[PDB]
């Protein structure tokens, strides 16, 4: 650049603006680590929950392969169709967008198999519960790793712009 | 010399004169014309040809003369941010008024000197202009409170009416402005 | 210019807030204009001939394209006519010197008449004994009742405060008033920037025997929220009012408000009494435990007034 | 849609309606998420966290071209019987996120 | 430097100048003409319905405002990832690149004033008809859709 | 003036004069004083004074400084954390390590001028808070090591004692400091 | 005067000069020699010795001069975007010219002046070199499009071979120049 | 700033320079010696077989290339994250830091050529032996005694 007084009165013109753009940058990332303190807490408490889907689910499930024969729970499985489609509805995080998932449904028992005793039918509720937990934990996670993902990159930007410019 | 607005002879004659118009080589290598800095201009007679403008152009130009330069401000006050974080950073608000202050500039401010309508302007066609302007402006913000997308907003037809409504000659204008005042209600107030 | 003759024609001393009660010592202005207008010129006429300021005050104007040692002798010749009033007859004195660049540029075209080789930046190496010669004048003396008060006023050539006659006279006074263009632009009339704005002497001339006893509290709690409501404000663009806490929505609100009805006074003319209640009633707007720099004393008297002042004076 | 866990879990998936799979070492775990991502698996893949420690390791080939599906880890049929400390696994990733250990 | 004394007075008294760019000489463009900083003062004098054609001064101010666009959306690419842009600004590059890749990029060839408005209407078709809004009506419909690949096979 | 230390008369000062005592108006906003910055304040004599130290004072008066100076700039190491996360987000160490430094800072660093007996304080007095602070932190660590938490010790009574201290006369001080060396031992040991 | 090339001396000089060979201190602080800056230097002579070079050296020798300058050029442009968003977010392509770059950068341009054979180069050695690093990197690229994992690439064992070429002597360079060649484009060919 | 008149008008006169760091300084390494920008023109006249041990240039530079790829590293792991590394990055990574404190850290102590060689050895010992690129083979197993520091 030319050295000019013009010059410099632009050049201590862009070190202002960019201090400024680093404070601003500082405010923007304790913004977002506070939002990402409680994005934990709630993925722990979907986790705490899933888990406890996951063992109601499979103490229904034990009980079905041995009261119940094994070719009968299996045909039970068998019969129904399977759960297809998945609907990911698109959800805003701080600019970016993530996607929200919620499963369709069939209703469950109006899909009942020949698998008629109890023990097996009340396996597949207890599955059927188990998703709907574990679509919320994935949901949460997802909501997480964005949050991150955007902590990270204010970090980078910071620390580039008051270690180079 | 050099464009160093610091030379002696410039600073004297900024200490003498009641208006100063600053022209930027910026703008010159971009071909907007006329040029001048909006920035780095300043004029001491505003105050005293209030009431001559109040008489002659309309009862409340002022009123929409400090409006338009509040928007400007508002503007310059943006691009600080925007040349930080990119246009897409910001929120809609923001975006509608950078997108504001960029028509303000391409269609009000810019003149061509060598066509043979846009050379001259009279004080009514520049108020119809900057009032039409405003409108847009008042409207779009209403829009955008109701959850109008802002790149809905941009592909309206009425910016192509309001951008060459600089060509129009002085004697279609009055009847001009009055069909864009009504087209412009009708962009947003009929369709919501 | 606006601002000099608003306070040339409102500036007054309160002698009741000093228990004292009586007007006894009388109070004038002298104002001193180098190298201004003939429109300058005209404007200042009228502005002291209008309200009848003018019965007061002592004017001595050098116009530009008089000769440049008169607007060297202009400001000795004001301030010995101040000095001799304030000191031979007890006076109260305030002087208004409307523009020292101009007086800085007259002395470095004199000095480089004269074949003497110029110091930093081109100016005279003796500039900043000069100032102080023009600037020391000024204060109050033991034994005497008369004061003089000075006032200079100087625009920044490139606004650029580390340019030298802004440095220096920074340097040798007691802070400064600083305008603002974003709040001229913006239509905020007067717009003085209360953020880079400073005064020195201000704790000694505030108290309980004078003014009123919440006047520091008030004056550091309305500078922090002001801070703190312009920081928001930046950030608010970016992320958004609905990702905004409550307290950032208040403290945005507070500095919108604030430079509404606080900085925005046009003409009107406020007594002390009056700003702190539009101060309080700005206050009033952030919640109860907030205000952290007032004493519990001041909030369980003052707290709680609802804006309704300025409409009193449109 | 497709959860890789034990053939009992997946099993009681099919149970569900899930697209259950059946797997007991890596490989043929991802050669599992390899071929539902080939062939388009819908959105949501659960594995078996006691199979693979994160299945976001074969999907860092094809992490680039989409963003519709999701992986995360869950425990197993038997693994789920016993107790599992999600608590460290959730400091792990603020470690990550962060830099540094956060509670105590 | 255009501050240095000999430049600056040179420019203040001729009727205009014609700047070479060392970035574009670096990149194998010759001449290496940076059209921003040039200019003609006595350049709409010979252009209009009896001198050449009569689209040539809204051509130019055109080509002037779109590679003035580009060159300014490469800085926002610098700053941001270049995968954030907008389909428009990813227009505005490609034309910048394409500009001066070939209508400033010629050789050691002679072209005629026909053929350079030709290459200026093919770049400029690389914008949708609505971005030209220096350019009146009638010469879009005239001139506007050329390829630029037609040019030369 | 404007505060730059680059400034040509700060530079040529520097370099002959022994010792640096920075002022920071940062920490006369926060009400600390005497308000000098430890940071950025330096001195060369340390070096040279130790054997007075030795005799006057202390034999082992340099080690105790040397401690409180690693305790005060470990302290400022974790300054970035304590801001980013929050003071409750840390460990146990770490928030021991912070309130170790608090304490230091407002029980041993900070001076009222205007008090009848805290405006004056000989060597004994600063080197006794010393020593006192150094074996409260090192019995703060053992009892973290031992599986007490940070909260239950910051609730001891001894810290009250502690603050106290750089209020008690001069020659009544001796008897104070024994007494609370043998509390700061007493208030974790017969606790276990 | 501090490296500064706006110096009188400097700038009367380079109006008269046929060649600039620009040195820079980054290059020589690592030691990285003999540190000509080749995006700042320029020559005049390269045009009016092109038919020289095909008699003398080779008939293809321009067009592999000019792919190198291409190579180091590309390079260039892909560095900032590296030091900007890090080498993992970059395709194979883009990964390939870098590592092409740093190959071309360390074992062509650098050269010891006190090695009793790297001291001095012949023409035919620097031709032979470069025909190497492009042969290489188009068998790279063909590889790369076949779905081979870059990574996989920075491990074959012709790097070496391509990285030890110039400490061979002046004698011994023509046929290990074809051995290097034949391994080049068989390690490749076995890869397929 | 090194291109102050005064030592810019010395570096044009002497053959080489010494340069002290701020970093290392803070770090508290004394005497606080920065190898990077550091240079003696005359030194491979000076050292050899007959003047010194005969693996001195060798090593000299081994030091130097190890030591610059650690801080490479080292300016790599503060903007993308440690999680990347290879083992051999985190290698360099540590061998680095054992360099700043072992090999610079010395102290008062006035140590002699063979033992500060020994140093010098003991941790390049701390890399593979096929990664000690710059030094022949010869004396490789002479000298890489794989063993650690005994300071």
């Given at each position: 650049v030319s050295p000019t007084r013009m010059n410099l009165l632009q050049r201590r013109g862009q070190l202002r603006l960019a201090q400024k753009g680093v404070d601003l940058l500082k405010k923007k990332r304790d913004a977002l680590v506070a939002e990402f303190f409680g994005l934990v807490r709630e993925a722990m408490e979907a986790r705490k929950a899933l888990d406890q889907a996951a063992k109601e689910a499979y103490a229904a499930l034990l009980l079905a392969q041995a009261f119940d024969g094994p070719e009968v729970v299996a045909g039970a499985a068998l019969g129904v169709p399977p759960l297809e489609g998945v609907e990911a509805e698109v959800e805003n995080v701080w600019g970016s967008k993530v996607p929200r998932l919620k499963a369709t449904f069939p209703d469950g028992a109006l899909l009942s198999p020949v698998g008629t005793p109890a023990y097996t039918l009340e396996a597949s509720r207890a599955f059927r519960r188990y998703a709907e937990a574990l679509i919320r934990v994935a949901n949460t996670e997802t909501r997480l790793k964005k949050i991150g993902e955007e902590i990270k990159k204010t970090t980078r930007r910071v620390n580039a712009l008051e270690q180079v410019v | 010399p050099g464009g160093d607005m610091s030379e002696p002879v410039t600073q004297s004659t900024l200490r003498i004169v009641g208006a100063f118009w600053r022209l930027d080589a910026s703008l010159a290598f971009r071909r907007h014309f006329p040029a001048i800095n909006w920035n780095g201009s300043y004029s001491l007679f505003t105050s005293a040809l209030d009431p001559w403008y109040r008489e002659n152009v309309a009862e409340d130009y002022p009123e929409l003369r400090d409006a338009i330069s509040e928007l400007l401000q508002r503007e310059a006050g943006l691009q600080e941010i925007v040349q930080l974080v990119g246009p897409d950073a910001l929120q809609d608000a923001e975006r509608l008024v950078i997108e504001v202050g960029r028509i303000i500039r391409e269609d009000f401010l810019q003149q061509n000197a060598y066509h043979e309508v846009d050379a001259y302007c009279s004080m009514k066609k520049a108020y119809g202009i900057m009032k039409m302007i405003l409108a847009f402006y008042k409207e779009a913000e209403a829009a955008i409170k109701r959850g109008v997308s802002i790149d809905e907003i941009l592909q309206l037809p009425v910016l192509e009416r309001i951008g060459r409504?600089?060509?129009?000659?002085e004697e279609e204008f009055p009847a001009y402005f009055e069909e864009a005042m009504k087209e412009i209600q009708g962009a947003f107030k009929a369709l919501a | 210019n606006e601002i000099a003759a608003q306070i040339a024609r409102q500036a007054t001393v309160r002698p009741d807030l000093s228990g004292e009660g009586e007007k006894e010592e009388p109070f004038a202005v002298v104002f001193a204009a180098m190298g201004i207008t003939q429109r300058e010129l005209s404007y200042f006429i009228q502005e002291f001939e209008r309200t009848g300021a003018l019965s007061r005050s002592v004017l001595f104007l050098n116009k530009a394209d008089d000769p440049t040692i008169e607007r060297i002798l202009t400001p000795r010749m004001a301030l010995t006519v101040a000095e001799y009033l304030a000191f031979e007859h007890d006076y109260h004195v305030l002087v208004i010197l409307t523009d020292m660049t101009n007086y800085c540029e007259a002395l470095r075209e004199i000095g480089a008449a004269r074949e003497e080789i110029p110091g930093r930046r081109g100016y005279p190496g003796y500039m900043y004994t000069d100032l102080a010669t023009i600037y020391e004048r000024a204060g109050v003396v033991e034994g005497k009742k008369g004061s003089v008060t000075q006032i200079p006023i100087l625009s920044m050539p490139d606004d650029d405060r580390t340019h030298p006659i802004p440095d220096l006279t920074g340097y040798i006074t007691e802070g400064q008033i600083q305008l603002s263009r974003e709040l001229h632009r913006k239509?905020?009339?007067?717009?003085?920037?209360?953020?880079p704005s400073l005064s020195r002497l201000m704790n000694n001339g505030v108290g309980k025997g004078k003014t009123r006893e919440d006047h520091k509290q008030v004056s550091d709690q309305l500078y922090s929220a002001y801070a703190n409501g312009v920081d928001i404000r930046k950030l608010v663009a970016i992320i958004?009012?609905?990702?905004?806490?409550e307290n950032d929505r208040r403290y945005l609100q507070f500095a919108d408000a604030f430079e509404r009805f606080f900085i925005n006074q046009g003409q009107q003319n406020r007594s002390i009494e009056e700003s702190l209640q539009i101060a309080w009633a700005l206050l009033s707007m952030l919640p109860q435990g907030e205000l952290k720099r007032i004493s519990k004393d001041h909030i369980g008297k003052y707290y709680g007034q609802k804006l309704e002042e300025i409409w009193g004076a449109p | 849609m497709a959860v890789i866990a034990d053939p009992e879990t997946a099993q009681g998936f099919r149970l569900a309606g899930l697209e259950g799979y059946g797997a007991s070492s890596a490989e043929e775990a991802q050669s599992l998420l390899e071929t539902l991502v080939e062939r388009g698996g819908y959105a949501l893949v659960a594995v078996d966290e006691a199979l693979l420690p994160d299945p976001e390791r074969a999907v860092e080939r094809l992490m680039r071209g989409r963003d519709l599906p999701v992986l995360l880890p869950i425990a197993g049929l038997k693994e789920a019987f016993q107790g599992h400390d999600v608590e460290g696994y959730m400091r792990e990733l603020v470690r990550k996120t962060i830099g540094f250990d956060i509670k105590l």
């Amino acid at each position: 650049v030319s050295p000019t007084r013009m010059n410099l009165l632009q050049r201590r013109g862009q070190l202002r603006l960019a201090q400024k753009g680093v404070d601003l940058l500082k405010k923007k990332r304790d913004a977002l680590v506070a939002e990402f303190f409680g994005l934990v807490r709630e993925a722990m408490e979907a986790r705490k929950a899933l888990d406890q889907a996951a063992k109601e689910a499979y103490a229904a499930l034990l009980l079905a392969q041995a009261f119940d024969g094994p070719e009968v729970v299996a045909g039970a499985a068998l019969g129904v169709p399977p759960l297809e489609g998945v609907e990911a509805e698109v959800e805003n995080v701080w600019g970016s967008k993530v996607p929200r998932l919620k499963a369709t449904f069939p209703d469950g028992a109006l899909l009942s198999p020949v698998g008629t005793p109890a023990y097996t039918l009340e396996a597949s509720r207890a599955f059927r519960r188990y998703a709907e937990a574990l679509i919320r934990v994935a949901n949460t996670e997802t909501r997480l790793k964005k949050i991150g993902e955007e902590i990270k990159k204010t970090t980078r930007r910071v620390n580039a712009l008051e270690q180079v410019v | 010399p050099g464009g160093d607005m610091s030379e002696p002879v410039t600073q004297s004659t900024l200490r003498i004169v009641g208006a100063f118009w600053r022209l930027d080589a910026s703008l010159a290598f971009r071909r907007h014309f006329p040029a001048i800095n909006w920035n780095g201009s300043y004029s001491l007679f505003t105050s005293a040809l209030d009431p001559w403008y109040r008489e002659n152009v309309a009862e409340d130009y002022p009123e929409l003369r400090d409006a338009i330069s509040e928007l400007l401000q508002r503007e310059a006050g943006l691009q600080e941010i925007v040349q930080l974080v990119g246009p897409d950073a910001l929120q809609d608000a923001e975006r509608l008024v950078i997108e504001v202050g960029r028509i303000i500039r391409e269609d009000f401010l810019q003149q061509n000197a060598y066509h043979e309508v846009d050379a001259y302007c009279s004080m009514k066609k520049a108020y119809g202009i900057m009032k039409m302007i405003l409108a847009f402006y008042k409207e779009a913000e209403a829009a955008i409170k109701r959850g109008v997308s802002i790149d809905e907003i941009l592909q309206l037809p009425v910016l192509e009416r309001i951008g060459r409504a600089r060509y129009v000659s002085e004697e279609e204008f009055p009847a001009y402005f009055e069909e864009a005042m009504k087209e412009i209600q009708g962009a947003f107030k009929a369709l919501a | 210019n606006e601002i000099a003759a608003q306070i040339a024609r409102q500036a007054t001393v309160r002698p009741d807030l000093s228990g004292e009660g009586e007007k006894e010592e009388p109070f004038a202005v002298v104002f001193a204009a180098m190298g201004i207008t003939q429109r300058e010129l005209s404007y200042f006429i009228q502005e002291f001939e209008r309200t009848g300021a003018l019965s007061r005050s002592v004017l001595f104007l050098n116009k530009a394209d008089d000769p440049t040692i008169e607007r060297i002798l202009t400001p000795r010749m004001a301030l010995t006519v101040a000095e001799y009033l304030a000191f031979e007859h007890d006076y109260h004195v305030l002087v208004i010197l409307t523009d020292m660049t101009n007086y800085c540029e007259a002395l470095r075209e004199i000095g480089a008449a004269r074949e003497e080789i110029p110091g930093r930046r081109g100016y005279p190496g003796y500039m900043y004994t000069d100032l102080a010669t023009i600037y020391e004048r000024a204060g109050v003396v033991e034994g005497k009742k008369g004061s003089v008060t000075q006032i200079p006023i100087l625009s920044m050539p490139d606004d650029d405060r580390t340019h030298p006659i802004p440095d220096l006279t920074g340097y040798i006074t007691e802070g400064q008033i600083q305008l603002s263009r974003e709040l001229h632009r913006k239509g905020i009339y007067p717009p003085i920037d209360p953020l880079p704005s400073l005064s020195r002497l201000m704790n000694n001339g505030v108290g309980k025997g004078k003014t009123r006893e919440d006047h520091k509290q008030v004056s550091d709690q309305l500078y922090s929220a002001y801070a703190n409501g312009v920081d928001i404000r930046k950030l608010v663009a970016i992320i958004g009012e609905d990702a905004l806490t409550e307290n950032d929505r208040r403290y945005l609100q507070f500095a919108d408000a604030f430079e509404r009805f606080f900085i925005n006074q046009g003409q009107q003319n406020r007594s002390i009494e009056e700003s702190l209640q539009i101060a309080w009633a700005l206050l009033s707007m952030l919640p109860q435990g907030e205000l952290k720099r007032i004493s519990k004393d001041h909030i369980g008297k003052y707290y709680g007034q609802k804006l309704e002042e300025i409409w009193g004076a449109p | 849609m497709a959860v890789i866990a034990d053939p009992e879990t997946a099993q009681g998936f099919r149970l569900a309606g899930l697209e259950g799979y059946g797997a007991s070492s890596a490989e043929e775990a991802q050669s599992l998420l390899e071929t539902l991502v080939e062939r388009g698996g819908y959105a949501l893949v659960a594995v078996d966290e006691a199979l693979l420690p994160d299945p976001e390791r074969a999907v860092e080939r094809l992490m680039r071209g989409r963003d519709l599906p999701v992986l995360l880890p869950i425990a197993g049929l038997k693994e789920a019987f016993q107790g599992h400390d999600v608590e460290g696994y959730m400091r792990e990733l603020v470690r990550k996120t962060i830099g540094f250990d956060i509670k105590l």
